[PDB]
Amino acid sequence: PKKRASNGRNKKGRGHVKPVRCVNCSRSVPKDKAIKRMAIRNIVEAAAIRDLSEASVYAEYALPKTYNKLHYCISCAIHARIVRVRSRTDRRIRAPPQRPRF
Amino acid sequence: VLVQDLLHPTAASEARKHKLKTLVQSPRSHFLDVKCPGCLNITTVFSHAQTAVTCESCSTVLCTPTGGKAKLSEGTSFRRK
Amino acid sequence: MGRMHSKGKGMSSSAIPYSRNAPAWFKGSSDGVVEQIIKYARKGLTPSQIGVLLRDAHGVTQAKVITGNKILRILKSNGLAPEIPEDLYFLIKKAVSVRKHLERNRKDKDAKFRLILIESRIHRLARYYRTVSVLPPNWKYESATASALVN
Amino acid sequence: MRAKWRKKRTRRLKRKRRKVRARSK
Amino acid sequence: ISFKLQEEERERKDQYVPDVSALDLSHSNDVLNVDTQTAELVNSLGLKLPLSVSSVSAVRDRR
Amino acid sequence: AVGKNKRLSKRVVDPFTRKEWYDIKAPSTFENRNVGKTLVNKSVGLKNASDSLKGRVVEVCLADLQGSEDHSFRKVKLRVDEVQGKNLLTNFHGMDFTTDKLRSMVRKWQTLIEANVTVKTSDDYVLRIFAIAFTRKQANQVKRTSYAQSSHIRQIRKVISEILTREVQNSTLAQLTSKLIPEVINKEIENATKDIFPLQNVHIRKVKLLKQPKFDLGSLLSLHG
Amino acid sequence: DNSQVFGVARIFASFNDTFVHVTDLSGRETIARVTGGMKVKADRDESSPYAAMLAAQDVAAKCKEVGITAVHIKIRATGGTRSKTPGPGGQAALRALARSGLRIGRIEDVTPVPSDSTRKKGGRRGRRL
RNA sequence: CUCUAACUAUAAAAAUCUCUCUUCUC
RNA sequence: GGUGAAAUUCUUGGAUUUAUUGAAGACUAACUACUGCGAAAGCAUUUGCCAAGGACGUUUUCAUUAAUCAAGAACGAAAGUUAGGGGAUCGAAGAUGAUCAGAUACCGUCGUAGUCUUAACCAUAAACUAUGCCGACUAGGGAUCGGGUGGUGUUUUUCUUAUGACCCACUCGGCACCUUACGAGAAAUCAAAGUCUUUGGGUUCUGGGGGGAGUAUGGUCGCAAGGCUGAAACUUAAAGGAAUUG
Ligand SMILES: [Mg+2]
Ligand SMILES: [Mg+2]
Ligand SMILES: [Mg+2]
Ligand SMILES: [Mg+2]
Ligand SMILES: [Mg+2]
Ligand SMILES: [Mg+2]
Ligand SMILES: [Mg+2]
Ligand SMILES: [Mg+2]
Ligand SMILES: [Mg+2]
Ligand SMILES: [Mg+2]
Ligand SMILES: [Mg+2]
Ligand SMILES: [Mg+2]
Ligand SMILES: [Mg+2]
Ligand SMILES: [Mg+2]
Ligand SMILES: [Mg+2]
Ligand SMILES: [Mg+2]
Ligand SMILES: [Mg+2]
Ligand SMILES: [Mg+2]
Ligand SMILES: [Mg+2]
Ligand SMILES: [Mg+2]
Ligand SMILES: [Zn+2]
Ligand SMILES: [Zn+2]
């Protein structure tokens, strides 16, 4: 039976979208059923911020960030802990998991 | 809502609804009398005109075709018919 | 909201005013309006352009309101009605244009389907104009006849 | 079984039978 | 949990009614601020109701 | 990891004894003209080093050339063409952004508009310039998206293209670079399209280079000192 | 400037055998190439942070002997059609490079990112594991 | 009745199973 | 290199990485969304040309010309087939190196046909919204795309204005969405799957337990692959749908 009224795709009026590959297993999966995660982070972690600051010329370097949108498959997304199985009454909710920190 | 007048709905609701959906369907358009600074002739034009209307005396456009209604020529003075 | 040859559902149209008689503010003469229609037709204009010219440049809301006859009816009374009705002629022109575009490039299949649609519409309108006997019963549509009628 | 592979096995039986008929046609 | 002393204290605190009026324009020198719309409401109600008009600057905050 | 099947299909020295340092000299259009040092093999009569330096492309941050930090995210490639002995002279070769800033401004819920133009400057230098712009949410837009229609995008691309053609055909990459440093072209492009669409973050990125007439000695020595 | 002789650190960290490869400003001159697999035994802990740590210490010693005192970090992932996410070792390589006296300037990420080109390895269903 | 910030990151191998199923009314 | 871990493989003829560049072919990242166009497949770099199209505006024109459709036709993903062109990547077959009791499977490295194209075929997909099309009515809440109306609205700046971009209100059309049952269902659920025992708006196609079987035969299309049409003999008391507790 229908487990998802949206079918998981989130297409609703296209018929076909262009697939994208998984970052882990390289699964040719449609771009909308290709759960996306925008990893924006520091090129140097908080573990080495002090070390870099003490041992860097150009006092108060901006310490540029790194940006990458990861296109996971769905099997990896279940397994690589990105997305989790949910209650059938919890599948309703599409909001992100409540603002990890405020 | 269960009891309500359709024979005499409010005129505000009349202007609220779409054309072709009133009690009796009536256009929302109207005509205008425009005067061009050139001569004293009064030209009758349409609100939603589709052509570059000019006075017969002078080759000066008075309206301009537009996806909706007419945009005038920045100097003509009109009165609603 | 039918859109005979597509999936459209629009209803964009015009609502004819309730009052059939002439508008109170109109001062022109019906005979003058008929003369204007005749002159516009003699210029080589189809009835729709005649109506648009009368609505824009003049106070003619619509010919039937002012004169009592329709534009094509007025032209026919004076013997200026074209031998092919305007809508069918425009369909012929569109069909010949798409056929020209097709013969100038073969690989375009979408315009081929659109030409099929236009030809179906032409056939339907020709059938209607044939049962009313506007067109002779031998009137039909093939290649090089559309060009002859258009040119 | 899958309908796909049953279909394919039928197609291979038709392979053999068509070759046999072509030999004896 | 609750007991006689605590509920009596709660009731006595509840019975607090301020002597000074917190309504009927006791503040703002017997003038209360409104906009046009509720002013026309008062007018159409056929009541005098001393008011003070102020436009609400229909531009809404971007939040 | 010593494992090596020695599928080879001591005469060892220290290569650093036969090497030395040259100095990189920036164009006068930049302030901090002392760029850095480059390691080079020692000069040999049969194979002179001075032939080997020319053609080198050094990549330096723009802020390293002007001292400020407003030019932190840009980057400039200089070409080694003429060596004066223990000090070599560099001409402009190209310009680019830093990937960090580029990814920082390429954000969701706004359309990026790219204008690409290949032109010829006042001299015979032939350049290719890329401009990138982003639609801006208005200071009153309660609507949370900031998308732009295709017509607006095409108009913006046309305007940026004509502006770049104008500002390249009217000057040389000496003057063109002296114009790029205060990014007045970005401001001009933003102002020319103020009526069409807001266009936040109008930037000129990856100023390429495709041709060079012969050598252009006199202006090259004139560009330095 | 107080005559800080500059180089570019130019770390390359794949998911196995990270690279630390310092060069001059031009980049045409290569010195102190010593890699992650250069210094570990397990043939697979080449990507481990300790391998990059040891490689970074070696390049720091070599370049300090050379005369270069400050370096420019150019972090590169494996790039191309692959995962193009930075390897586990390169981060520790950068930390160890910043540890050993060397000064740090203009960290950049120079991973090669494509315009969705050259179909990825793995087949339509990809690596099944 | 007043707000848009923090972040990562493991996939070794594991095939198979025989009986026999039995009422609910004051 | 690569991996769970290894090995096959390339390397002091100096590989892996390092800088400029050059060649080829494919692709069009990030922008990319419960967003758009199209009859469906499908469509994502820029510019020009070619024609086409939906929606809206219309006091323009014809006056039933229309809805669905046996026969007939046009397109029809991928794969595949003839030839000519190319030949980067990835990769059916194959070659191996591993894992295993076996592994000619999954992990790995090479690797033809193919992938990319110009003509000619093919007409099948979980070609799915598993919901035919046209038409009417029925319930509340926001947003979103295209168009159009009004604002004594706001920033824009070209002194003011005109645009544009927003803000508020309304309307038409579209992909959609939230709540609810007061309706429908065997329920999962549906704002249509409602207005159906209080059973009739028009109309086309399909199904009558499971298997045999979409098999044989006979036609018909195709170079071939195969497509369309398509039973019976016989066997069986179930097969199947949704949901509840373990
Ligand atoms: Mg299931
Ligand atoms: Mg999903
Ligand atoms: Mg659609
Ligand atoms: Mg698994
Ligand atoms: Mg080499
Ligand atoms: Mg793109
Ligand atoms: Mg769009
Ligand atoms: Mg049929
Ligand atoms: Mg093919
Ligand atoms: Mg071939
Ligand atoms: Mg094999
Ligand atoms: Mg084997
Ligand atoms: Mg394989
Ligand atoms: Mg390969
Ligand atoms: Mg089928
Ligand atoms: Mg079906
Ligand atoms: Mg049966
Ligand atoms: Mg069956
Ligand atoms: Mg047969
Ligand atoms: Mg079941
Ligand atoms: Zn995956
Ligand atoms: Zn005049």
Curated annotation (Swiss-Prot), chain F:
Description of how the protein assembles with itself and partners: Component of the small ribosomal subunit. Mature ribosomes consist of a small (40S) and a large (60S) subunit. The 40S subunit contains about 33 different proteins and 1 molecule of RNA (18S). The 60S subunit contains about 49 different proteins and 3 molecules of RNA (25S, 5.8S and 5S).
GO molecular function (one): structural constituent of ribosome
GO BP: any one term: translation
A Pfam family reported for this protein in Swiss-Prot or TrEMBL: Ribosomal_S3Ae
Family from the record: Belongs to the eukaryotic ribosomal protein eS1 family.
Species name: Kluyveromyces lactis (strain ATCC 8585 / CBS 2359 / DSM 70799 / NBRC 1267 / NRRL Y-1140 / WM37)
Disulfide bonds: none
Organism superkingdom: Eukaryota
Main location: cytoplasm
Record keywords: Acetylation, Cytoplasm, Ribonucleoprotein, Ribosomal protein
GO cellular component: cytosolic small ribosomal subunit
Name under which the protein is recorded: Small ribosomal subunit protein eS1
Compartment(s): Cytoplasm
SMART domains, per database record: Ribosomal_S3Ae
The keyword Ribosomal protein belongs to this UniProt entry's keyword annotation: yes
Modified residues (N-acetylalanine): A1
From Swiss-Prot, chain G:
Region (Disordered): 108-129
Protein name as it appears in the record: Small ribosomal subunit protein uS11
Compositional bias of kind Basic residues: 120-129
HAMAP family: Ribosomal_uS11 (MF_01310)
Record's keyword annotation contains ATP-binding: no
Any single GO CC term annotated in Swiss-Prot or TrEMBL for this entry: ribonucleoprotein complex
Covalent S-S links between cysteines: none
A GO BP annotation: translation
One Pfam entry name: Ribosomal_S11
UniProt keywords, alphabetically: Ribonucleoprotein, Ribosomal protein
Membership in a protein family: Belongs to the universal ribosomal protein uS11 family.
Highest taxon above the source species: Eukaryota
